[PDB]
Amino acid sequence: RVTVKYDRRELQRRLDVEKWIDGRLEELYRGREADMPDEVNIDELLELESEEERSRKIQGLLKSCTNPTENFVQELLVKLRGLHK
């Protein structure tokens, strides 16, 4: 999806939300490290009762850079509790 670095606190958690991107962002946004933020619906959509509608909005959020994103949205999960940004 589109969330690199993220906030702080619960980093053993964000550590999973720090690796999903470090590699994905590593290229999915490499020269775009500043073109994608870690503060979108990924967090709320993560708290949605749906299944992929959460990724549907996050998918159009960063676009191809989002492409298939199920393990990346899962990380948002271990991080959404940090500070939501």
UniProtKB/Swiss-Prot annotation:
UniProt keywords, alphabetically: Cytoplasm, Phosphoprotein, Protein phosphatase inhibitor
Keyword Phosphoprotein (UniProt): yes
Alphabetized GO MF terms: protein serine/threonine phosphatase inhibitor activity
Compartments reported by the entry: Cytoplasm
Assigned protein family: Belongs to the PP1 inhibitor family.
Entry function: Inhibitor of PPP1CA. Has over 1000-fold higher inhibitory activity when phosphorylated, creating a molecular switch for regulating the phosphorylation status of PPP1CA substrates and smooth muscle contraction.
Entry protein name: Protein phosphatase 1 regulatory subunit 14A
Organism: Sus scrofa
GN (gene name): CPI17
Positions spanned in the full protein: 36 to 120 of 147
